Amino acid sequence: TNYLHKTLAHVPEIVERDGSIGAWASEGNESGNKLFRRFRKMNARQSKTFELEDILKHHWLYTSKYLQKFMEAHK
DNA sequence: CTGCAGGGTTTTTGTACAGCCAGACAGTGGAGTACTACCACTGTGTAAGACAGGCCAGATC
Ligand SMILES: [Ca+2]
16 A cells, blocks of 8 residues: 555655655645535525635635634643 | 639731822713614515305295
């Protein structure tokens, strides 16, 4: 199998070269994609002409540091 | 024992010089900021009307 081959043959090379792996996890996008699941439910327009547009808007809004910083609010 | 009344007794309560400043009253000219109903759009539930086919009556096999 593939990943097995990667991990028994190719781990050391990349770990040597590009600093760190798992650092570049795809985990983030897929894992977070459940946000695209929920946003469609709650804040839809709704009409697919807009459904994207407003979903993307809310998403990026939820994504910037700035509002996350203001969400922490002194721990 | 009881009820009632002069005063006690301490607390509470308002009236009392005396000066100070927060807080409000008018309005001005309209911005403007908050509010309230369109509004474009389809997803979801709904229930009137097709309808068919199953059944009884008419009449038959
Ligand atoms: Ca995936």
